[PDB]
Amino acid sequence: NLVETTCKNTPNYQLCLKTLLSDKRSATGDITTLALIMVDAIKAKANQAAVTISKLRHSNPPAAWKGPLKNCAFSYKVILTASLPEAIEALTKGDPKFAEDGMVGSSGDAQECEEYFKGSKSPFSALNIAVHELSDVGRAIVRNLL
């Protein structure tokens, strides 16, 4: 019952469980594999956010959203091109401290994104919240190895 036990040691059991059991690798999965499955979930959501940000920026958004959008674009670019790749590298290399830092970064960047839309509607709030939730679950999985 590693998936059960692992997901119990996360800040969101039901999300962890739903996510790991979607993936085929979970049934035969050690802690690192489960980390690896979470990263790929974060990546799916981050790719969606990246496109969604781009669309909005191309849809003649109100001026007040230009700042937030532009900053969010940078956030997801870092997540996609640096944070997540380095986590996959680190988990592969057997160096989890560096994969925890990927999960910490992606969580803060998604949260910082949401935060720019404070006091207004947030046009892709669910995607920010998903990247943060999923990231906070990956970080917990990763910390079993520290």
Dihedral of alpha carbons 125, 131, 133, 134, sign: positive
Alpha-carbon distance values, 104 to 24, 31, 39, 70 (Å): 26, 18, 12, 21
Establish whether 97 is an annotated binding residue.
yes
Nearest residue to 16 via CA among 119, 103, 146, 112: 103
Q: What is the distance between the alpha carbons of residues 34 and 21, in angstroms, rounded to a whole number?
A: 10
- Mark the binding-site residues for beta-D-fructose, compressed into ranges: 95, 97
Q: Binding site: which residues? A: 95, 97
